[PDB]
Amino acid sequence: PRSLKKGPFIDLHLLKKVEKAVESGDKKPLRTWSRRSTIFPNMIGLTIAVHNGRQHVPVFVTDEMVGHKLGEFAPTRTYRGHAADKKAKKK
């Protein structure tokens, strides 16, 4: 297994996004480039739009996803299935 080693991360980018977001409880989805960032208690009930490189994809932040990174809910690679080859695109 892999880990986060030993130091403390809160991410600089989510600290400053979250501080302005919490004050209303919630507002419209926060435009996020931070795919490096873990999910945290401070972020519970926010809606984080996560750039995947092509576009932002909405991740709804909630208690069950705190063991995880923002970049896990938001996808990257495309899988061609083998019922039959993928004919179409998905955005």
Partner: protein, 70 residues
């Protein structure tokens, strides 16, 4: 009523007013107020950064580096 085909009565006909004496009478939360994940929710419970045990030696509060030293 066909009595005999119904299972034994030890805890049936006895004591419909019973305690929690070996087992509870009612569970909480099974009517699902949040949808069930079957997960323990990590870094919510618990810690994002690992335990420090092993390599227990007196801390140096002023900057130090093992290859930066000769």
């Amino acid at each position: 009523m066909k009595k005999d085909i119904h299972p034994k009565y030890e805890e049936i006909t006895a004591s419909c007013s019973c305690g929690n004496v070996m087992k509870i009478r009612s569970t909480v939360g099974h009517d699902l107020n949040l949808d069930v994940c079957s997960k323990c929710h990590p870094f919510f419970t618990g810690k994002q950064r690992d335990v420090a045990t092993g390599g227990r030696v007196d801390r140096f509060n002023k900057r130090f580096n093992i290859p930066g030293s000769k």
